[PDB]
Paper text:
Here, we report the isolation of three mAbs that broadly neutralize sarbecoviruses. All three antibodies recognized epitopes within the receptor binding domain (RBD) and inhibited the binding of soluble human angiotensin converting enzyme 2 (ACE2) receptor to the S protein. All three antibodies recognized a region on the inner side of RBD that is hidden in the RBD-down conformation. Thus, they can only recognize RBD in the up conformation.
Given the binding breadth exhibited by 10-40, we conducted additional structural studies for this mAb to investigate the basis for its cross-reactivity. To this end, we determined crystal structures of the 10-40 Fab bound to the RBDs of the sarbecoviruses SHC014, RaTG13, and [name] at 2.2 Å, 2.8 Å, and 3.1 Å resolutions, respectively. As observed in the complex of 10-40 bound to SARS-CoV-2 RBD, the majority of interactions for 10-40 with SHC014, RaTG13, and [name] were through its [name] and CDRL2. Such extensive overlap suggests that for mAbs that have deficiencies against some of these sarbecoviruses, engineering of similar interactions could help to improve their breadth.
Residue numbers in the entry:
A (entry chain H): 1 to 35, 35A, 35B, 36 to 82, 82A, 82B, 82C, 83 to 100, ...
B (entry chain A): 334 to 515, 521 to 528
C (entry chain L): 1 to 26, 27A, 27B, 28 to 66, 66A, 66B, 67 to 210
Write the structure that this text describes.
Amino acid sequence: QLQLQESGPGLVKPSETLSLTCTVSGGSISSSNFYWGWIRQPPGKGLEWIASITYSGRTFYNPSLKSRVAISVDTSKNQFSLKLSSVTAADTAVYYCARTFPSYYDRSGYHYLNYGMDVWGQGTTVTVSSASTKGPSVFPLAPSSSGGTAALGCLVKDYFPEPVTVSWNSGALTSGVHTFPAVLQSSGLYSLSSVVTVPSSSLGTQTYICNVNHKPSNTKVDKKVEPKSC
Amino acid sequence: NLCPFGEVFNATTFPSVYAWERKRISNCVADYSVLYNSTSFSTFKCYGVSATKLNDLCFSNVYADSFVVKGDDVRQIAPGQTGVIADYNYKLPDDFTGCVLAWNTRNIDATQTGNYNYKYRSLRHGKLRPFERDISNVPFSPDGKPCTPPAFNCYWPLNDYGFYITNGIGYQPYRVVVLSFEATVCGPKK
Amino acid sequence: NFMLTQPHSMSESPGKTVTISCTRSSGSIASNYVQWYQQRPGSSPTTVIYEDNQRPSGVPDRFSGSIDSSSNSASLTISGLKTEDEADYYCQSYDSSSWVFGGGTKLTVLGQPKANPTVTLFPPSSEELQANKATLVCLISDFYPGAVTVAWKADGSPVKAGVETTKPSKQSNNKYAASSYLSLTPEQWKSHRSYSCQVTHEGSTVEKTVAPT
Ligand SMILES: *[C@@H]1O[C@H](CO)[C@@H](O[C@@H]2O[C@H](CO)[C@@H](O)[C@H](O)[C@H]2NC(C)=O)[C@H](O)[C@H]1NC(C)=O
């Protein structure tokens, strides 16, 4: 029940400094056995280790990133945090803050430390691009004639960068919800649509609201979806 | 006087992990060659403190903590692993300065016939805070739907290891000893 | 330092065991510990083997790890492989410079249903036409195998641009999902009676059609 949570900027502009922070929940960051570090995965490529730190201050870096990485601990706010400076366009990735297995001295005193990740985080998507953020344009996708159980939605037009998250009825509605991937358009921007297959018989009783949270523009939109007049 | 390590290690019945026991080790001198090169120890790992530099150190106390889990369940005695041996029975803390030891005891704690003495709580109400215990076998209702109204639902909290000399290593008894550290217990060569 | 060369893709039918052979290039294998992470699509990784062979809690029993030191290699082995395990898999080890991850083994199990899609086509709503845009939305869920061709119509004749189709992702019920978008003006939506989304999966076009008000 130690849980790791990433809080991140979404956009870092090119050859600036990525400002990342991992919020730790269910343990102490001042815990000497545990190393705490970051793993990235650029999209469609594989995983990669970046750095790790404990609150000895002892730090091991990837030496192909050691010129550009500083990783730092803030114990009063329970967090550890990553600076990645001098960013190329191929530093676009999903960054995973992570705890290691606990560091031990074995039979013969050989100190195994910082060696594989244990609790993973949720990720936050870091996008390196030159142009700036656009918040989405949320439109309801109303039902009509349904195939015995009706289906309704939220088109989330035109945003940069990913992710929007979309819940439904503020988290009440789980069953029938299937949120799709987002297209990469002709114009740099993204569009997804979230669907929920509802009951056919509830559309003048029951109140259906999608909840598009684009955190890279502070957009929540809690858009209501009601039917049509054919 | 002298510190009683062997008087936890070589004892001829251990506890279970539901009702594990502790023996305070105090005002004495503690030797660590006996712990370094005993090579029956199939898992022997020390967190924050080096086993080969325990000879050269002082501690306020040593607390021995001893039980039997099955041989699959031994790696649950680590800082920050979950599952019922960690969650409901012997939760090691994250800031544990100590050692975790185990050794294979299939020869001594497993009969052909069926050794059912050694036990494990698989079912509890909330998770267990570190260095805490529930010896009680008050029979575990499914969290609110109570037990003893007339035998409706309580799945009993303890289950038990049936240990056999004719299983593989997943279902084999491992005596597991934890020697937690914490200036009246020190070494030789120190 | 070293590399960890996984096979990029593997297949094995349900039930009978698979093995992912992650080979370390220079430096011998069991000097350092091997950990395996399962990543499913759209998901976090989860550690499933650690310290060459040991299992965390919640990881099924069939997930066994070993070290194969003849070809200097490291093996994740899954007996009884259910359709749960369609996932990426990554060995990771280290030396006295950094950690080297593996390249990903894309495990897929091949004896699974051939499902033609369930296509839900949406018209551009009134709240979008008054912003003076239109985007039809073709919503192609629950299919297998995971490629479709999504063609469009302008009454009876096709539409050759304005289409922004996705590339299919895997759903977490282990079938597939793709969307396709048809951005427009509001006049072009209103000046045909019928815009159709034709979704051809294994020669079985499932088509859907709308109309203006
Ligand atoms: C547990 O008991 C065994 C024997 O039953 C002890 O083993 C002996 O250890 C001494 C240590 O100097 C050796 O000289 C002997 O050769 C060992 N004998 C055998 C038969 O193994 C062992 O030390 C005891 N363990 C602890 C921790 O006290």
